[model samples]
Target: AVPSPTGTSVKSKNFRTVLYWQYPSMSETPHFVVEVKPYLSGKYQTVSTCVNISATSCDLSEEINEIFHSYWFRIKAIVGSQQSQYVETDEFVLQKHGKIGPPKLNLSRHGAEIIVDVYHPEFPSVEVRPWMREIYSELSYSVIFRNSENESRKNFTVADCEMNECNLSIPVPSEGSTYCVSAKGHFFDDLIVGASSEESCIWVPI
Candidate 1:
């Protein structure tokens, strides 16, 4: 008997949205189909690209546009002529539940000042419009610096970092020591806090 797909979940990161689920273990692999219902619409529509697919996850970035609109996604399993009951995901909104990943950071030291170049997050989906464009003009950046030897941390916020790159200055805590830096993007008006970047360290010379 074909069993319904379980653990249906929808998540968005860096403006990319995807649906994930687990299928029942069986001798015969089952193909999956996905459907979505918009907030205002009562009926569900089949996702064109995800219909009768074998993958366990589906990319919904293209269908789930309109950041403020709510959406519901459902998946089912099909083995030969047998079909399973539909498993639906909870209501999701891009603006509310979606998370933005950290920006790229490049760190360098010039004399006593540390130079940090912060770049915006990356969006991999080609079909969907990037949400960053909407708030790029008002976007800000926060960079964190840590002393590798002492573990002391300091955070700096750059309010005028809407451009392609951001630069910050930090004093060298000590000579012949290593310092690490990470950065994240922020939009205060919408209360969006981005993910923290991976730390990159640079050793300072005397």
Candidate 2:
């Protein structure tokens, strides 16, 4: 689907900076275009050109930051003039979002099911720390699972999970099959995902 792009980049300084993130699809590599929009007027404007683009990232550092220097960004892809829909990021969340550590993850294989569990602590450190308290409770977890043999991937949100820990189960694959699972924490209604936790694995035949 040639849609708008799926990424946004920001440079807090006066000079320009490049935008980068995990590319959206693997259907084929496509040249991408970056766009900027300001909140006041509800209008979107694009950058200068699209000749050189990266398979996994785009460099839009040449464009100047204007409009009180506050803006939201979006992207679309191009393949021989065919374009994808524009995927946009929440500017409010983008500006307000902060980094929290990844969750502790566990995966287990029991006969015909794969169990997933994710955890986050109020204090993720050994020493006493002072910061926003509710931010930890505001955090939510997402579980990512991949077929170790086939490399297929799926992401599940722990919507039913209300606390720091939740348990889930997925149908197990065939005999001798296994999966790699990872966990990450995101704030309320935010799309951007920071670094993920170390991967854990399970086997159907285990």
Candidate 3:
């Protein structure tokens, strides 16, 4: 008998959603079918792009659009003549379950202050992502700076951006010293905070 897909899971980062599953059956190649049920919608609907495909994962970011909506998903394995029982997910809600990934950080030097700019996590759209700030309107950022030579760190401070691109003024600790910077995002209303961004460093000119 064909076996049901195992380890079926949903992943959400900065509101981009994807479904993943594992199939251990070794006898034959199997096509996987995916479905989703929006809350208050009584029945599961087959995903148009996800039916009978060989991929182990499916992108559901567009299909599961509403950030505040609740959803459930399921998947099954199919061979030519046999099929496996469906493996279903439990109460997949985007707002509560989705993770706010680390923000993107860039740094440059102008005079005594380092120019720090932070941006939302990115995706390819030929132009744009769905926009995290829209999903969480009260979004803001907390940026942290570190003195690389002494390994001393400064307290984190907040910088909220109106255009989704946040720029901050950071004073140089000392001349000819290198400083590194990173940032994290915060949703004021939800109290949701994301991981810190990768560090970007700049050298102070003497």
Candidate 4:
């Protein structure tokens, strides 16, 4: 997750930057190092020291602004001398922005039930604000199911949820079956977004 600067204007003269990353999987060399530099200068500067293996992210002090003249940053996972692929963020433009979207769901079957796992980022902040108003946030999920025989199916709504995390369960049909599911949310029940899981199949026991 990218940490947006808090103030109305970026205090380039005295600014602190923080970043967070989630790895695809665990590694033996369980540590990561960060490097930041001007986007086009080709010259790189190591802004941080050997970060702990338990940490998937780090924050750089305002002093870093004095070394690098640009906003670009690059990070790599280090297991001794060998390094994993470099992951880069969008060129740090020194601005504030918002994003809202649904979680991506992976579906599988266990015996007679379908299991779904959802992964997604946090809900974006709504821009419009009243005079002296505070921001409120919430998340929710919903599902739709269908069967292969075209004889049975249903839709269900799951409300009041957190952003992007789930192990939703749905029952399987008596006969061989196939179905689809979707999850979605709303920002104060006004700005809404969601996604549908891919269709999956499971055969009932005879």
Candidate that scores best on TM-score? 3
Candidates 2 and 3, the one with greater TM-score: 3
- Residue-level lDDT of model 4, residues 11-59, one tens digit each, is 2211235556666443453566666666566655665553444466566
Q: Of models 1 and 3, which has the larger TM-score? A: 3
Whichever of 2 and 4 has more lDDT, that candidate is: 2
Comparing 3 and 4 on TM-score, the stronger one: 3
Of candidates 4 and 1, the better by lDDT: 1
Q: List TM-score per model, in order.
A: 0.77, 0.45, 0.80, 0.38
Superposed on all Cα atoms, model 2 deviates from the true structure by an RMSD in Å of: 14.0
lDDT of 2 at 5: 54
User: Per-residue lDDT for 1-206 in model 2, tens only?
Assistant: 55555445443221124465455565666777767676666687875564336554544434422312355667777766587777765552222333456667877766778888877653333122223233444556788888869768888877445545678888755657778899877766464344588988776773
* 8: Cα error in model 2, Å: 27
The global Cα lDDT (0 to 1) of model 4 is: 0.49
lDDT value for model 3: 0.78
Off by over 4 Å in 2: 1-97, 122-138
Residue 20, model 3, lDDT: 94
Tens digits of per-residue lDDT for model 1 on 92-181?
987788897888888887897899988764754333457545555556788888886876888888766534467888888676788888
* lDDT of all predictions: 0.81, 0.60, 0.78, 0.49
